[PDB]
RNA sequence: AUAAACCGACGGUAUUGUUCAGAUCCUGGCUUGCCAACAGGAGUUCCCCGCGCCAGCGGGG
């Protein structure tokens, strides 16, 4: 990478590429590897999306309707439903599948990672 | 001056040892190459040297 690649990608970030990176890196990325662990599907899970016209119409089309959400995710339960960041995992937690609420599962983020104060006005790199 | 630029897939290695292709076998029998025929007209025989020259005679190669 450091032969192959053109340098300083990463010097600075916008907000938006850096919430972007974040979910990235939470769903479809395979880091950090050591005492990091990926989730809730696994490593380089592939991702599969209907494509409209538009951005909007494409957003939509990939949303679940309200009775088959229901159906997928069955509410049960004992399901916590607060998201990583408002509620936090507890440490070596033993975690059953069907107690993740479908607000938590999808913004499921096992990184454990604070982003570092910002600076300011310039370009994204 | 291009997903470009700068840019080895690299180093190490017997395919080795043993082994008759052997024994039997006539290519045999029959066939004219025959018919015709002056070699004679011609003195050119290429190079030098000596002596002759209506002639030619010699000496070398
Ligand atoms: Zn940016």
Same mark, same amino acid.
């Given at each position: 990478?450091?032969?192959?690649?053109?340098?300083?990608?990463?010097?600075?970030?916008?907000?938006?590429?850096?919430?972007?990176?974040?979910?990235?890196?939470?769903?479809?990325? %395979?880091?950090?590897?050591?005492?990091? *662990? +990926?989730?809730?599907?696994?490593?380089?899970?592939?991702?599969? $999306? #209907? =494509? /409209?016209?538009?951005?909007?119409?494409?957003?939509?089309?990939?949303?679940?309707?309200?009775?088959?959400?229901?159906?997928?995710?069955?509410?049960?339960?004992?399901?916590?439903?607060? %998201?990583?960041?408002?509620?936090?995992? *507890? +440490?070596?937690?033993?975690?059953?599948?069907?107690?993740?609420? $479908? #607000? =938590? /599962?999808?913004?499921?983020?096992?990184?454990?990672?604070?982003?570092?104060?910002?600076?300011?006005?310039?370009?994204?790199?």
């Amino acid at each position: 990478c450091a032969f192959v690649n053109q340098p300083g990608q990463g010097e600075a970030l916008c907000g938006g590429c850096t919430a972007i990176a974040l979910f990235n890196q939470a769903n479809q990325a %395979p880091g950090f590897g050591g005492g990091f *662990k +990926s989730g809730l599907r696994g490593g380089t899970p592939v991702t599969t $999306f #209907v =494509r /409209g016209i538009d951005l909007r119409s494409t957003v939509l089309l990939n949303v679940l309707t309200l009775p088959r959400l229901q159906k997928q995710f069955p509410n049960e339960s004992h399901t916590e439903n607060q %998201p990583t960041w408002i509620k936090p995992i *507890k +440490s070596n937690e033993s975690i059953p599948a069907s107690s993740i609420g $479908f #607000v =938590r /599962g999808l913004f499921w983020q096992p990184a454990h990672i604070e982003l570092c104060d910002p600076i300011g006005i310039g370009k994204c790199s």
